[PDB]
Fold:
Amino acid sequence: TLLRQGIRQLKEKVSKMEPEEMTVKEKKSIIEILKARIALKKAFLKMALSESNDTVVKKEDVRESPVDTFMENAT
Amino acid sequence: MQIDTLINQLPGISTAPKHQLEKIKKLQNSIEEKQLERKSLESENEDLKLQLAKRIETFGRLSCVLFQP
Structure:
């Protein structure tokens, strides 16, 4: 959510080789502070990631195969 | 007086047992001929229905293969 594109919006905000960047980054870090708590909202972990999710989708891919078998026998 | 009504209620008011037994003869002519048919039914039924149910059993078993690939 906000953690995603918030990085995208903070990312372009860097400007000038001069150390004025902090004046921008102070606006960033506060959001990041919120992110530190926004991340708390997302303190969950069901599935790991890939490839386990891919294994799930493939698991249905075999599990959807019978549907074109016995159901065909129904017809 | 109620007994008189009871006299009206007595079964076989026609009072013709000789005919009643003939009625029973017709009853044999019906029932006894029905018996062979009604008995034949189960023989025409379950004798195949078992095997057909077994034919269902085969598909039911082969469903398990899909159940445990």
Remarks:
- Helices of chain B lie at 2-9, 17-67.
- The CA atoms of residues 7 and 50 of chain B lie 56 Å apart.
